[PDB]
Structures are given as structure tokens and as C-alpha cells.
Amino acid sequence: GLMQFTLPVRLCKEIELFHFDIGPFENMWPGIFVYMVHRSCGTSCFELEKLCRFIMSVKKNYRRVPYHNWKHAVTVAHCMYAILQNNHTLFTDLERKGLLIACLCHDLDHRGFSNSYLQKFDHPLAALYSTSTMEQHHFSQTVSILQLEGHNIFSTLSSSEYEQVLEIIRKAIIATDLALYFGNRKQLEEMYQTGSLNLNNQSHRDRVIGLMMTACDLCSVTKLWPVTKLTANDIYAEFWAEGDEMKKLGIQPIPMMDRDKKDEVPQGQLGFYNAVAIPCYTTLTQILPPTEPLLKACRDNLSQWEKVIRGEE
Ligand SMILES: Cn1c(=O)n(C)c2cc(NC(=O)CN(c3cccc4ccccc34)S(C)(=O)=O)ccc21
Numbered sequence: 001g002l003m004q005f006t007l008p009v010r011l012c013k014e015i016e017l018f019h020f021d022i023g024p025f026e027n028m029w030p031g032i033f034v035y036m037v038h039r040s041c042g043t044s045c046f047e048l049e050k051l052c053r054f055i056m057s058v059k060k061n062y063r064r065v066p067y068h069n070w071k072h073a074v075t076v077a078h079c080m081y082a083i084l085q086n087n088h089t090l091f092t093d094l095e096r097k098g099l100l101i102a103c104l105c106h107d108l109d110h111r112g113f114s115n116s117y118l119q120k121f122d123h124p125l126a127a128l129y130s131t132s133t134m135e136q137h138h139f140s141q142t143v144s145i146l147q148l149e150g151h152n153i154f155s156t157l158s159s160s161e162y163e164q165v166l167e168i169i170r171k172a173i174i175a176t177d178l179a180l181y182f183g184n185r186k187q188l189e190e191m192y193q194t195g196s197l198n199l200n201n202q203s204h205r206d207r208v209i210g211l212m213m214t215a216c217d218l219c220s221v222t223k224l225w226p227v228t229k230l231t232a233n234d235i236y237a238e239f240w241a242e243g244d245e246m247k248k249l250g251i252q253p254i255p256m257m258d259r260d261k262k263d264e265v266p267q268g269q270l271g272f273y274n275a276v277a278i279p280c281y282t283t284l285t286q287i288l289p290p291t292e293p294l295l296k297a298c299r300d301n302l303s304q305w306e307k308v309i310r311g312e313e
Pocket residue numbers: 114177178179217218220221232235256269272
């Protein structure tokens with residue numbers, strides 16, 4: 001009950017900032033996550049013993065892929081931690097509990113391939129789930145781990161509170177399917193501009209939580225340039241392997257995934273920043289003004305990719 005997690009001074013200060021990097025020491029990431037739950041939620045949200053057993057079963061079920069790994073899970077949870085702490089009074093007790101868990105679990109048992117590669121491979125998961133294939137799998141794995149003995153971190157909630165939080169987690173994890181992001185942000189745009197955005201409309205909250213999840217999931221584009229640049233190598237290492245596996249099926253992959261077209265990467269980044277990331281953090285900053293540092297950092301990194309193209313690095 002009286003057992004706080006405390007971090008070293010540099011981490012204690014830097015963890016509050018959006019651009020915080022969780023660092024290369026794997027063994028500190030569980031402590032970082034717990035620290036965040038305790039300040040985001042309270043020392044009493046979760047029985048520590050159950051939380052710790054949950055965190056380690058979740059860690060065990062992330063695979064050793066270059067990008068979609070345990071480190072990505074904790075990075076995405078940290079961004080959500082920053083958004084929740086800069087928007088203290090906007091979110092329910094259940095939402096604060098559910099969203100940090102949703103983020104930690106959002107890519108459970110990812111294999112480093114897109115939904116598209118499962119569909120063309122004809123992977124069994126693509127028969128079981130026709131859309132948001134990996135994301136429905138991630139939620140399924142979350143429910144599995146919650147049902148291991150000693151792993152029910154929500155055991156003290158009522159029957160209806162438990163169903164509310166598992167429903168927040170399901171919507172939150174489905175929303176990380178970027179195919180769904182485009183329409184979700186367009187609707188949030190229209191709603192904000194016509195002035196119909198109402199945070200007491202559950203269907204509006206759902207949409208706003210969906211955009212937060214896209215924002216946290218993409219948060220590698222909002223780090224200081226050297227973090228963003230080095231993470232892009234991990235991302236492209238998965239993409240090029242997928243490209244390779246497409247060619248193995250007799251399918252020319254999109255250039256973003258073709259390792260023979262590495263030259264085209266910097267222009268592809270611009271595309272991605274302009275088509276996906278900037279629109280995402282723009283709309284998020286309109287709905288949640290204190291999340292502006294994410295937009296500013298995203299713009300700084302767009303400018304750094306422009307410099308890569310212009311030969312200036
Ligand atoms: C930090 N960071 C970064 O620098 N890049 C390039 C990043 C890409 C993603 N994530 C995807 O690029 C996902 N994909 C998509 C791309 C475009 C439209 C899609 C539309 C629908 C679905 C999927 C789309 S993909 C190629 O097909 O796997 C996440 C983080 C990134």
C-alpha cells in the first residue's frame with residue numbers, strides 16, 4: 001500500500017514530457033509503466049502483485065520483431081500517460097485505468113506484418129477476422145492474459161464497470177487500425193468545426209479516444225530527431241521483410257516496403273507526415289489543446305526529413 005515506485009531524477013522529470021524516450025534498459029520498462037499507472041490512476045487502481053504478473057505475461061507475449069515489440073508497447077503507453085496527465089480533469093476513473101492497459105496491450109503477439117500481408121498470405125487470422133485482422137487478435141490476446149489465474153487486474157470492479165473498461169480497451173485497440181483512422185479524424189474535424197463535438201456523447205468520446213490511440217501509436221514521429229531517425233530504421237526493417245514476403249508470393253510490394261527502393265524512403269516519410277501524422281496531431285491539438293507539443297515535435301521532424309532530401313544530412 002505504502003510502496004511507491006520512484007525513478008532516478010532525470011527520468012522523474014523527463015517522463016512527464018511528450019518526447020520522453022524510455023531508454024535501452026529493458027528491465028526498467030515495467031517499473032516505468034507502474035510509475036505511470038500510480039500517478040495517472042492512483043496507487044490503489046491495481047493490486048501491485050496482479051499488475052506485475054500482468055505486465056510480465058504481456059511482455060512475454062510480445063515477439064522479438066524490429067519495431068512492433070515490447071519497447072513499442074511501453075513507448076505508446078508513455079504517450080497516453082503524457083496526454084492523460086496534461087488533460088487531468090477530462091477523463092473518467094475507468095478511462096484512465098483502461099487506456100494505459102489498452103496501449104501496453106495494443107500490439108500483443110504482433111508478427112511484424114500488416115493486415116494486407118495476412119490477407120494475401122491467407123493467414124488463418126484473416127478467416128477468423130475479415131477487417132482489423134491483427135487488432136482483433138491483439139484484443140483477444142489481452143482477454144486471454146486477463147483470464148490467466150492471478151492476472152485479473154480489474155477483479156475489484158463491479159460486473160458493469162468490468163464490461164465498461166473491457167469495452168474501452170476493445171474500441172481503443174481496434175482504433176489502432178490506421179485504415180479506420182482517416183474517417184475517424186475526418187468526422188472529428190467536421191464535428192469540431194460545426195461545433196457539434198460534445199464530450200458527454202459516448203459515441204464522441206469513443207472517436208476522441210480513437211484519435212488519442214492513433215496519436216500514441218504514431219508517437220515515434222514526435223520524438224527528438226535522433227530518436228525518430230533511429231526508430232525509422234526499425235520500422236523500415238519490418239516493412240522491407242514484408243516486401244520480401246510479398247515478392248515470395250509473386251506480388252510486387254508498394255515501394256515503401258521494397259528494399260531495392262531505399263532511395264525513395266525520405267520522400268515516403270514526407271508523404272506519411274503530410275497524409276497521416278500532421279493531420280492526426282493537428283485535429284488532436286484542436287480537441288485537446290495541451291497536446292500541442294506533439295504537433296510541434298511532428299512538424300520539427302517533417303522539417304528534418306525535408307533536410308535529408310535536400311542533401312543537408
Ligand atoms: C514512426 N513511423 C514512420 O516513420 N512511418 C512511416 C510509420 C508508419 C506507421 N504505420 C503504417 O505505415 C501502416 N501502413 C499504412 C501507411 C499508409 C496508409 C495506410 C492505410 C491503411 C493501413 C495502413 C497504412 S502500411 C505501410 O500499409 O503497413 C506507423 C508509424 C510510422
